Design a binder for this molecule. Structure first.
Ligand code: NA
Length: 266
């Protein structure tokens, strides 16, 4: 729709652009999936990440030529460290899931980091697409707050995905009734929290910035919780863009889980 340039496609707000980029990459990923098919999963996953990255860098160049870009799929020249505006993107989160027939738990992550003196809310705008799920795009400018708790009281559903369960989860399951819910891709795990399909998404051991920046942005915009496991803020555009761990969860469950994590270390 035709509109006036936002106060303070061409002429999108940053959140609009994040959403449009996520949707466009999502469509391309769906095209690649259809074209290549599933008989060679390695090749499928590689073609998808490579082509989605090309689309995203091309369009960020065109529509935001002054902004820096940290992409999972591109070399990192560290110019971003000097920038006040940095896109943190994963063109394809969940290559295994993308390359498996029938699975829809893979995502595209598009996040804008903006330099903040005080307030520290670094990811200002973001979108997560789940292309196989009707190409739904979750966006910081439309997600809503106040979601009503869905599960049986006294039991937590927690999205996790790992080649092996972390020790901290073993410990907190001694004290809290938890059902681990196996979902692929960081993006799908996080959006399950937004959806109310699970109560929390927990990750121990490292994760790259591009797989949590967009989910975290959307989570905070929805009034939910996103932090390190020790409760300190997630930091982005770091020299080493790697987060040792994280918790995203609905607001009501944050104190219980942060508490259990802290008590684990006793
Ligand atoms: Na990727």
């Amino acid at each position: 729709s035709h509109h006036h340039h936002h106060h303070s496609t061409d002429d999108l707000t940053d959140a609009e652009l994040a959403a449009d980029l996520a949707a466009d990459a999502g469509k391309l990923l769906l095209q690649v999936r259809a074209e290549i098919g599933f008989d060679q999963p390695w090749t499928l996953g590689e073609a998808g990440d490579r082509q989605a990255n090309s689309l995203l860098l091309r369009r960020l160049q065109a529509e935001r030529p002054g902004d820096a870009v940290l992409s999972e799929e591109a070399h990192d020249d560290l110019a971003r460290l000097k920038s006040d505006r940095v896109w943190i993107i994963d063109p394809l989160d969940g290559t295994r899931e993308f390359s498996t027939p029938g699975r829809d738990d893979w995502a595209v992550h598009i996040a804008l980091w903006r330099r903040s003196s005080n307030g520290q809310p670094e990811i200002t705008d973001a979108a997560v697409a789940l292309p196989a799920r009707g190409n739904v795009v979750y966006r910081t400018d439309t997600v809503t707050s106040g979601a009503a708790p869905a599960g049986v009281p006294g039991t937590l559903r927690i999205a996790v995905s790992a080649t092996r369960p972390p020790a901290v989860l073993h410990r907190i399951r001694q004290t809290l009734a938890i059902q681990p819910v196996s979902i692929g891709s960081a993006g799908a795990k996080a959006m399950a929290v937004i959806d109310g399909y699970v109560d929390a998404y927990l990750h121990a051991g490292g994760q790259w910035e591009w797989d949590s920046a967009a989910p975290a942005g959307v989570m905070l915009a929805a009034g939910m919780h996103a932090s390190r496991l020790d409760g300190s803020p997630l930091r982005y555009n770091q020299l080493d863009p790697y987060l040792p761990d994280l918790l995203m969860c609905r607001a009501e469950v944050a104190p219980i889980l942060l508490g259990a994590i802290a008590d684990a270390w006793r």
